[PDB]
Design a protein around this ligand. Structure first.
Ligand SMILES: Nc1ncnc2c1ncn2[C@@H]1O[C@H](COP(=O)(O)OP(=O)(O)OP(=O)(O)O)[C@@H](O)[C@H]1O
Lengths: 412, 434
């Protein structure tokens, strides 16, 4: 059967668990369209003791304005396509995180932060975000970096310059990030405009049209369970679905995902038999024409971005294919990726496919390790006063952050 | 599985390391004096130095002459040409008698030619021609084991273009032969139309690039024939080749002179090595006096193979002499050119061993009480009749629901199928009704 999801934990804190040593201790903030997660950087502690505040990045407020259910409690989200594009909800989303993390005393957030952002971020979105973050929250210095390259930075052997493909896959996008001696090669980097949200929406739509007898009993928040728990990506899809064609293998693998009970009852309380549906939804990021989209998908994009390099520099980045983000939770994801890669590498040539030590939380642990290592750097952070002489589109180009384009934004 | 045959049990001469015969070995029994003589002939053929030297296996019907000639073939194995012919094969209607001898003498001398068989196969990812016309063609190949690019010559590209190849076809290229085969469109394109008149093959589950050191076998007669007449020249892909049917033809001794002078030019380079072989002119008594008299050149010539003759005829007339009797049916002038090996009638115990070797080869379980009867019926008749009863007797035993021969099965078969000498008595009695 399904479970049901948690709500309303009590992660309340003091003015803040501010660590010893130098005065600043930064917040580590990860923003993505599935979940926000945030914690103090906890310097001098080798394992992060708690990536605090795991909660769904979706919020509600009363029709008289009287209360705001920002935490895990219909609802709305401040992102579009895994970039933040909001003010009036983005503030109450930040407020919830700071209020649970602890606020020191005065009319600003106390101490510096690393805030995770989209691969490329539209200049206006970083401007709107830095404007919120300096006008309302007043942070003394700020770092912007990428969830994917942070999770890579954690999974590195060392504080060393590296080359690789980051195969990222968040809630509403999956991106192939080629990197060259720590620099994200944003000139020829690519993304597929699909992810876990669209695979879960597809898995909902499949079971809606399979079971019109109870369109209300299935729901997106239950599809998120069977998509994480019981779905798997094929070793190769046209062969997996061929072994699903025979009733003996089908009956051995079709899942009794029962609805909660009050004819054999199943007309109202079905076992919701999922068979090829526990494959189809995972395959969306490899074959997005399953949801009708004409995008090249994660296998042909990896070929298309890779073959644009000189042959002698394709090797030392296929030497670190790095799988990361929420969809890489699927069992078999490494085993699929190394086949899709063997089918396109030169005949004898080596490749290496690494999976993030945690498929998703390593974005935050990466931003933590990054902030801990870069805490006392000057040139690496946007310092508060720089926002009076740079327009808020500005970026510092540290490792695990995007290219900066010398530019300005007109506004009134 | 394989089919059992009249000789499928003989696997060698069965001689020991001294060159003397074992009583029963490598599927043969008895016959020691002739087997020891064949031991010397196997050493002669393995020694390569000799040309045209020849042997006659002489002796009664059903005494092992063809079994020993095939034992020589098995001692040498596939690595040295053994060419079997009946003397009756000489009567062609497209070429003269004394040509068919020379063709078969040239089949018994081999060339052994090593080459590194070098196969590429996979989905063609691209074809891109590169002089201003075509210097070379880059081709890309993919399989579920990886990818390669090849730099094809323009003649291989003409072959891709004759095979009607396009990007996404699954191709087999052989880099030695320049052979090209389209195998189908790669099935990743099987949705390109909902019906198209093509076969879609899955992307190969194998290497883009495969190597063997293959070791080719070819004979001077393959060279003589493939160089004498103008070749068919085109891979079908033509219709001039509809008009002129082939025939066998009297290949001139002047061409064979050049084929010899060319093969010397290649074996000096070590590109090929020679394997002097055996021609087995089985039942040589069926050659005509003109064929026999041509052997008085062919056995002298410094190129010729070793030749093994066989005969079972008495003091009979030489075929085509209309009058002249001579031993083994062979002219005395040729019989003075061959080393004769005698062949003998067996004792009953030596037949009984052959009956068991036949049974345990032919797949028959046989009880001793029936094997003693086939040993006796061999003495009443001939060795080949006894051996021929085994499968019929087993096949009645199988129909009678039994796992083995017993006396009643062979006894019933004896009274059901006659031998060549009991049947001759029926024809001598009923003489006026046949
Ligand atoms: N060790 C053996 N010794 C002699 N003959 C054997 C032996 N092994 C097999 N044979 C027998 O050889 C017989 C057939 O070939 P064989 O040489 O006797 O024919 P042939 O009459 O003598 O000569 P030809 O082939 O010219 O007719 C078979 O019955 C086979 O069982």
């Amino acid at each position: 059967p399904f479970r049901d999801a948690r709500a309303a934990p009590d992660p309340v804190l003091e003015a803040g668990p501010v660590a010893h040593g130098p005065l600043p201790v930064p917040l580590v903030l990860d923003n993505g369209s599935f979940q926000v997660r945030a914690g103090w950087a906890c310097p001098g502690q080798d394992p992060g003791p708690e990536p605090r505040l795991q909660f769904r990045a979706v919020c509600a407020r009363g029709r008289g304005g009287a209360r705001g259910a920002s935490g895990p409690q219909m609802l709305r989200s401040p992102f579009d396509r895994n970039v933040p594009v909001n003010l009036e909800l983005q503030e109450l989303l930040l407020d919830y995180s700071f209020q649970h993390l602890g606020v020191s005393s005065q009319g600003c957030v106390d101490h510096p932060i690393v805030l995770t952002e989209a691969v490329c971020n539209p200049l206006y979105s970083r401007q709107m975000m830095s404007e919120l973050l300096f006008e309302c929250y007043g942070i003394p210095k700020v770092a912007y970096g990428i969830d994917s390259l942070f999770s890579f930075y954690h999974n590195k052997p060392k504080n060393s310059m590296c080359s690789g493909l980051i195969i990222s896959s968040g809630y509403q996008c999956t991106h192939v990030l080629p990197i060259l001696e720590g620099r994200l090669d944003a000139k020829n980097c690519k993304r597929i405009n699909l992810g876990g949200s669209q695979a879960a929406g597809y898995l909902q739509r499949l079971l809606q049209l399979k079971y019109p007898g109870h369109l209300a009993a299935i729901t997106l928040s239950r599809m998120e369970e069977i998509l994480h728990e019981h779905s798997y990506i094929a070793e190769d899809y046209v062969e997996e679905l061929h072994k699903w064609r025979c009733p003996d293998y089908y009956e051995n693998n079709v899942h009794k995902m029962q609805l909660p009970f009050s004819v054999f009852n199943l007309a109202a309380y079905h076992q919701l038999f999922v068979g090829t549906e526990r494959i189809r939804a995972p395959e969306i990021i490899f074959q997005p024409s399953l949801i009708g989209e004409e995008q090249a998908g994660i296998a042909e994009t990896l070929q298309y971005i890779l073959d644009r390099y000189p042959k002698d520099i394709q090797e030392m980045l296929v030497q670190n294919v790095f799988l990361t983000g929420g969809n890489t939770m699927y069992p078999g994801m490494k085993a699929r990726m190394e086949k899709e890669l063997l089918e396109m590498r030169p005949f004898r040539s080596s490749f290496q496919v690494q999976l993030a030590s945690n498929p998703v939380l390593d974005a935050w642990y990466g931003a933590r390790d990054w902030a801990l290592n870069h805490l006392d750097d000057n040139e690496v952070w946007i310092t508060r006063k720089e926002y009076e002489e740079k327009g808020g589109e500005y970026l510092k180009e540290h490792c695990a952050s995007n290219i900066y384009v010398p530019i300005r934004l007109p506004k009134q | 599985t394989q089919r059992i045959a009249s000789h499928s049990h003989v696997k060698g001469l069965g001689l020991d390391e001294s060159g003397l015969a074992k009583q029963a070995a490598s599927g043969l029994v008895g016959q020691e004096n002739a087997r020891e003589a064949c031991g010397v002939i196997v050493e002669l053929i393995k020694s390569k130095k000799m040309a045209g030297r020849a042997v006659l296996l002489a002796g009664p019907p059903g005494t092992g002459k063809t079994a020993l000639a095939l034992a020589i073939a098995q001692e040498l194995g596939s690595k040295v040409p053994f060419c079997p012919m009946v003397g009756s094969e000489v009567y062609s209607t497209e070429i003269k008698k004394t040509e068919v001898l020379m063709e078969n003498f040239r089949r018994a001398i081999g060339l052994r030619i090593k080459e590194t068989k070098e196969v590429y196969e996979g989905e063609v990812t691209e074809l891109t021609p590169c002089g201003k016309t075509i210097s070379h063609v880059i081709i890309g190949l993919k399989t579920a084991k990886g990818t390669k690019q090849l730099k094809l010559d323009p003649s291989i590209f003409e072959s891709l273009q004759k095979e009607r190849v396009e990007a996404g076809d699954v191709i087999y290229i052989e880099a030695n032969s320049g052979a090209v085969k389209r195998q189908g469109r790669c099935d990743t394109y099987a949705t390109e139309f909902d019906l198209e008149a093509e076969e879609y093959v899955p992307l190969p589950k194998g290497d883009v690039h495969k190597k063997k050191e293959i070791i080719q076998d070819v004979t001077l007669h393959d060279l003589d024939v493939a160089n004498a007449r103008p070749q068919g020249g085109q891979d079908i892909l033509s219709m001039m080749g509809q008009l002129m049917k082939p025939k066998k033809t009297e290949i001139t001794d002047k061409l064979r002179g050049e084929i010899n002078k060319v093969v010397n030019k290649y074996i000096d380079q070590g590109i090929a090595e020679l394997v002097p072989g055996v021609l087995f002119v089985d039942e040589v008594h069926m050659l005509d006096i003109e064929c026999f008299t041509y052997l008085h050149r062919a056995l002298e010539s410094s190129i010729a193979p070793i030749v093994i003759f066989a005969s079972n005829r008495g003091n009979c007339v030489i075929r085509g002499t209309e009058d002249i009797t001579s031993p083994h049916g062979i002219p005395l002038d040729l019989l003075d050119r061959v080393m004769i090996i005698r062949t003998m009638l067996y004792t009953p115990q030596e037949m009984k061993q052959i009956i068991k070797i036949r049974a345990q080869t032919e797949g028959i379980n046989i009880s001793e009480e029936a094997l003693n009867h086939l040993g006796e019926i061999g003495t009443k008749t001939t060795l080949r009749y006894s051996v021929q009863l085994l499968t019929p007797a087993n096949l009645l035993a199988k129909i009678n629901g039994k796992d083995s021969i017993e006396k009643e099965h062979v006894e019933e078969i004896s009274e059901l199928f006659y031998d060549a000498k009991s049947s001759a008595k029926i024809l001598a009695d009923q003489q006026d009704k046949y």
